Ligand binder design. Structure first.
Ligand SMILES: CCCCCCCCCCCCCC(=O)CSCCNC(=O)CCNC(=O)[C@@H](O)C(C)(C)COP(=O)(O)OP(=O)(O)OC[C@H]1O[C@@H](n2cnc3c(N)ncnc32)[C@H](O)[C@@H]1OP(=O)(O)O
Ligand SMILES: Cc1nccn1CCCCc1ccc(CC(=O)N[C@@H](CO)C(=O)N[C@@H](CCCCN)C(=O)NCCC2CCCCC2)cc1
Length: 422
């Protein structure tokens, strides 16, 4: 259908038909001297803008913008609540630039009415290093939808990034578009089933009673794992080396330096429990050789439409890593596959205890990576929403996000997708 995308049909992206043999760039090489130094045009009523995260009324402009016009569920009763803190983490990774925090203020009043964003990252498509940028936070004010302002924001953020000599991008979106490299599904391990129920995040399956469900989803008040401790700087190297090792396993990943890792996993110390964004943990055995690591972050829902409650606490399982299976085999071979499982099913379970204890009403995950071994087992239910990963200017061989054709967790053949968008 690429032809019906009046805009996308002009972009360096893979296609629906097109099968590939050799993964590589889509445009004939370019160089910054080739790119325009002039920001694109926009109706006279509006002026481009650049957002300094460290400016307080600018962060404020964005936080408000997205807080009222960003992504909602398919039925519009819940909306993402990205907090200023969260922005402070995600928009300032190492290498970030204010020139890539593009805003679009209306000139007469200056009201921020559009945003699009890029932070730099280095991909690992089938192990082939690829200097790219990661895109996220594309948002246009509700009263400005359909004015086809988006292709501009893209055309403009692309332009700025080319000017820094980068030519590739990783972006994920829900809607279907040109080259889904892979796809995944969100799932939900209820922490506060009754509340989820009282705000219509879920319903009551027949033959069941709140007690039944409430008991069915019950979680221990204390984690069940020795060595289970929360990451510190001191660990980085072993951890980082551990993570690096583990993720080797997937066809599509981010190639974290050590710094743009520590930042990604240990957030600003100042912040209190109700503010904190990233929750990273590790398992330090007696001899020290920490063997386990997993993280998750907090990204609530603004419960629009409800009188019983105004906010939903949600914890998204982030990155994780474990030595189980590999020190064992070569192939992800059975005796080793199930070897991981039990160890995984044991980690995440504590993630759910941990997340629950941090006040998260529901714990989410994606059927990407080896999520599939523990999901069903750990009671992660099927979400109604899905996520599509894409690559701008790059021929990639379709990779795996854990879904059998009936959108069922593919427990056998897991997921080749290694990144985890924020
Ligand atoms: C190497 C450098 C290059 C780097 C750049 C790489 C690509 C980046 C672009 C992708 C950015 C998405 C990433 C994320 O942020 C995560 S996903 C988070 C996304 N956020 C939201 O959904 C928040 C709430 N929604 C809105 O704010 C939305 O308003 C909107 C901004 C998403 C879309 O704006 P709009 O509804 O007013 O439509 P429009 O008239 O302005 O433009 C339409 C054209 O753009 C495409 N259109 C509509 N929604 C789209 C979407 N989410 N992604 C992409 N295209 C979209 C369409 O396919 C179409 O074009 P066609 O004619 O071709 O069909
Ligand atoms: C990069 C990025 N980060 C965040 C967003 N994006 C990009 C935007 C495109 C990705 C996207 C769009 C919209 C959403 C919101 C969303 O889809 N929410 C769904 C996720 O699946 C949801 O809340 N599902 C819940 C509630 C929806 C109810 C209203 N329809 C569900 O299935 N709940 C039932 C769970 C239940 C299963 C059984 C066990 C108990 C829990 C998520 C991601």
């Amino acid at each position: 259908a690429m032809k019906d995308h009046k805009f996308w049909r002009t972009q360096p992206v893979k296609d629906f038909d097109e099968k590939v043999v050799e993964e590589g760039p889509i445009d004939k090489p370019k160089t910054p001297e080739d790119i325009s130094d002039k920001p694109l045009p926009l109706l006279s009523s509006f002026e481009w803008c650049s957002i300094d995260v460290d400016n307080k009324k600018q962060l404020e402009d964005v936080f408000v913008l997205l807080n009222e016009n960003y992504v909602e569920d398919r039925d519009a009763g819940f909306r993402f609540n990205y907090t200023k803190e969260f922005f402070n983490w995600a928009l300032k990774s190492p290498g970030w630039k204010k020139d890539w925090h593009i805003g679009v203020r209306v000139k007469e009043t200056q009201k921020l009415v559009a945003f699009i964003s890029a932070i730099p990252v280095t991909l690992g498509v089938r192990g082939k290093q690829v200097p790219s940028v990661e895109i996220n936070f594309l948002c246009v004010h509700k009263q400005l939808r359909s004015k086809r302002l988006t292709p501009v924001l893209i055309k403009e953020i692309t332009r700025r990034v080319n000017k820094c000599d980068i030519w590739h991008a990783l972006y994920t979106a829900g809607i279907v578009l040109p080259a889904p490299v892979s796809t995944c599904r969100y799932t939900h391990r209820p922490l506060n089933w009754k509340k989820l129920y009282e705000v219509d995040f879920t319903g009551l399956p027949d033959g069941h009673t709140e007690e039944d469900m409430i008991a069915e989803n019950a979680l221990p008040a204390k984690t069940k794992t020795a060595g289970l401790r929360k990451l510190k700087k001191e660990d980085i190297d072993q951890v980082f080396e551990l993570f690096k090792r583990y993720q080797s396993r997937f066809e599509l990943i981010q190639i974290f330096t050590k710094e743009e890792f520590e930042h990604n996993f240990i957030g600003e110390e100042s912040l209190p429990l109700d503010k904190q964004v990233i929750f990273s943990y590790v398992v330090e055995q007696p001899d020290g050789k920490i063997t386990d690591f997993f993280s998750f972050y907090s990204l609530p829902f603004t419960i629009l439409n409800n009188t019983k409650y105004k906010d939903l606490g949600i914890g998204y399982l982030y990155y994780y890593a474990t030595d189980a299976d590999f020190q064992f085999k070569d192939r992800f071979d059975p005796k080793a596959t199930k070897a991981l499982k039990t160890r995984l099913c044991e980690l995440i379970y504590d993630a759910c205890i941990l997340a629950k204890n941090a006040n998260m009403d529901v714990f989410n995950a994606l059927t990407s990576q080896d999520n599939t071994l523990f999901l069903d087992d750990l009671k992660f239910g099927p979400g109604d929403g899905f996520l599509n990963f894409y690559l701008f200017n790059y021929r990639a061989k379709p990779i795996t996000g854990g879904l059998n054709p009936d959108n069922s967790n593919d427990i056998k053949r897991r997921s080749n997708v290694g990144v985890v968008m924020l």
